Amino acid sequence: PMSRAYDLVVLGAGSGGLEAGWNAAVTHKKKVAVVDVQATHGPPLFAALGGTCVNVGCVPKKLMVTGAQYMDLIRESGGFGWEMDRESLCPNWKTLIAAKNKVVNSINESYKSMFADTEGLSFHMGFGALQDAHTVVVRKSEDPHSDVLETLDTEYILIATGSWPTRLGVPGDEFCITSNEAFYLEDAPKRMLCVGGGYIAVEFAGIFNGYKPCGGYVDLCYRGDLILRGFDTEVRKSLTKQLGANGIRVRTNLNPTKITKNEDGSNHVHFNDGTEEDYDQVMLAIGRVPRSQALQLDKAGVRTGKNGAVQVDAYSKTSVDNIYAIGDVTNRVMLTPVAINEGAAFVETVFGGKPRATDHTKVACAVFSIPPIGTCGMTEEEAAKNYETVAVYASSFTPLMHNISGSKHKEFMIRIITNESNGEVLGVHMLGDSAPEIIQSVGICMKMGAKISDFHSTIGVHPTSAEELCSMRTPAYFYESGKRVEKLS
Numbered sequence: 001p002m003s004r005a006y007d008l009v010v011l012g013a014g015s016g017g018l019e020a021g022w023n024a025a026v027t028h029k030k031k032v033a034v035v036d037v038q039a040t041h042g043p044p045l046f047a048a049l050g051g052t053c054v055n056v057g058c059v060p061k062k063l064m065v066t067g068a069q070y071m072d073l074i075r076e077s078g079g080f081g082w083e084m085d086r087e088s089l090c091p092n093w094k095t096l097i098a099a100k101n102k103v104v105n106s107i108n109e110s111y112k113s114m115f116a117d118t119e120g121l122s123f124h125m126g127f128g129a130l131q132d133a134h135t136v137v138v139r140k141s142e143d144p145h146s147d148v149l150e151t152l153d154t155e156y157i158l159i160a161t162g163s164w165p166t167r168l169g170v171p172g173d174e175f176c177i178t179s180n181e182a183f184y185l186e187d188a189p190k191r192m193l194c195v196g197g198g199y200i201a202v203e204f205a206g207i208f209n210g211y212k213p214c215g216g217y218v219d220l221c222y223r224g225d226l227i228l229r230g231f232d233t234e235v236r237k238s239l240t241k242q243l244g245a246n247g248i249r250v251r252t253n254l255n256p257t258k259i260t261k262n263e264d265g266s267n268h269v270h271f272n273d274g275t276e277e278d279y280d281q282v283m284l285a286i287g288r289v290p291r292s293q294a295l296q297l298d299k300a301g302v303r304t305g306k307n308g309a310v311q312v313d314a315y316s317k318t319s320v321d322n323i324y325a326i327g328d329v330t331n332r333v334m335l336t337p338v339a340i341n342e343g344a345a346f347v348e349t350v351f352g353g354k355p356r357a358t359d360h361t362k363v364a365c366a367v368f369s370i371p372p373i374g375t376c377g378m379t380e381e382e383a384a385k386n387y388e389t390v391a392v393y394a395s396s397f398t399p400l401m402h403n404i405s406g407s408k409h410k411e412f413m414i415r416i417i418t419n420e421s422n423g424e425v426l427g428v429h430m431l432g433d434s435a436p437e438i439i440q441s442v443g444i445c446m447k448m449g450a451k452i453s454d455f456h457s458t459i460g461v462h463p464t465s466a467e468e469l470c471s472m473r474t475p476a477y478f479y480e481s482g483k484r485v486e487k488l489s
């Protein structure tokens with residue numbers, strides 16, 4: 001029967017939202033409205049049709065990291081006989097941004113063709129907010145007194161509005177940029193400060209390092225002792241070293257207290273230690289918080305916790321039974337394939353009749369640092385707490401090509417965290433070229449409950465960095481009852 005205009009209204013046409021909207025509309029023939037604030041990428045809104053990863057996230061970030069890598073690859077070609085004038089060779093940033101804009105734009109265009117050509121799936125441009133459990137309002141602006149454009153009468157509501165960069169909140173915070181503005185910079189900065197120690201700060205440090213003009217430099221300033229909290233300790237220390245050798249100055253236990261604007265348009269930065277310094281740009285990558293604050297969630301009575309995160313059960317359902325929330329807005333794991341999986345599971349549950357909850361354990365991820373990280377499962381620190389007896393397997397080697405390339409700092413590192421009792425693999429931590437590609441396949445094995453014996457019984461593929469996975473038999477050391485031991489009782 002027809003009660004309402006739509007079966008489903010989706011707030012946010014991102015990784016989660018479009019998966020949900022598309023699945024609900026084509027495989028279940030439901031009537032689906034999808035709300036987003038613009039159709040094409042660009043400031044001041046930044047995010048658009050396709051969401052954060054397509055417009056100002058992993059797609060454009062990966063293109064720019066690929067771009068930055070050519071600095072290393074061009075240097076390394078010399079050893080192999082490639083002679084070119086490397087005297088003051090630095091790249092054209094405008095070329096990169098033009099090329100990246102062209103690619104993202106063509107994805108935005110591809111999503112418009114999807115909407116126009118897909119029956120029962122419609123796109124509603126503006127700002128979503130709830131009036132009640134069955135009514136979503138689309139406005140011209142975020143401001144709740146702005147003109148109402150549409151009133152969407154709907155059975156189910158899916159909240160998939162993702163996240164937004166946190167600010168520093170100090171005098172001169174407004175002279176700083178984020179990931180959002182970094183993507184639309186008119187020029188590659190000569191003197192770059194990346195504030196933060198998360199995967200975004202580190203990935204962007206490597207981009208600015210690759211595209212810096214000829215006398216330029218990148219500083220990475222983190223308020224803690226060691227970058228990349230939540231990652232393997234030895235991977236974090238080895239990457240810190242390898243950023244150093246690539247020319248990035250990593251500064252620990254440091255936070256800006258004050259930014260002021262210089263005469264020439266640069267930024268004077270004061271720090272904890274008393275130090276003052278000038279940077280052409282200062283970028284903040286210090287957190288991303290749910291975008292729940294303009295959705296009028298209290299009006300409809302949807303439970304908000306954490307940093308404005310929407311509370312859900314294993315089925316991504318809110319306090320209101322017809323309203324669901326997925327992706328970065330629910331906190332949990334802020335990854336694109338997770339949001340897509342929750343979106344898929346939401347449609348299977350509510351419209352498919354076949355209930356499913358997204359499995360958030362043993363999810364592999366990557367950091368597109370130079371060099372990159374590939375990780376799946378737990379650190380030895382959290383293994384040694386939750387587990388009786390833990391074996392740590394560890395191997396570091398230098399691909400022979402780096403004897404020729406000159407890049408002798410490029411240690412490839414594998415670390416396997418195991419349960420000593422049954423040999424079950426709890427964690428795999430890799431640092432080096434192709435780690436993100438290798439870890440995907442490792443994620444499959446770990447899903448199937450792979451044991452260390454499954455790794456070293458596999459015939460190697462020679463020569464690769466990945467064959468070292470299948471040559472780790474003897475533990476480096478153990479933990480019994482959460483304490484590190486040389487050898488086992």
Ligand SMILES: Cc1cc2nc3c(=O)[nH]c(=O)nc-3n(C[C@H](O)[C@H](O)[C@H](O)COP(=O)(O)OP(=O)(O)OC[C@H]3O[C@@H](n4cnc5c(N)ncnc54)[C@H](O)[C@@H]3O)c2cc1C
Nearest residue numbers: 012014015016047051052057058128162327328334335336
């Ligand atoms: C720089 C960067 C790099 C990243 N790299 C990776 C990576 O390599 N791998 C990875 O897995 N993840 C990566 N991520 C994370 C990834 O982008 C997110 O986890 C993912 O986009 C979350 O999808 P979502 O559906 O939850 O929300 P989003 O994709 O953010 O969807 C939100 C959408 O809703 C819109 N919207 C917001 N508020 C409203 C409103 N009130 N009304 C209507 N529409 C609204 C937004 O404009 C946006 O289009 C990266 C993130 C950043 C910032």
Ligand SMILES: C[n+]1nn(-c2ccc(-c3nc(CCc4ccccc4)cs3)c(OCCN3CCNC3=O)c2)cc1CCCCN
Nearest residue numbers: 018019022026103106107108110111113114115117118119
């Ligand atoms: C004629 N027609 N064209 N489309 C269409 C259009 C676009 C897409 C997509 N484009 C992209 C971007 C890919 C891209 C890659 C390189 C350059 C540019 C874009 C991802 S999904 C697309 O993919 C749908 C799969 N999706 C989308 C979101 N989640 C999914 O699983 C489909 C649909 C239809 C009718 C459907 C049947 C019901 N009447």
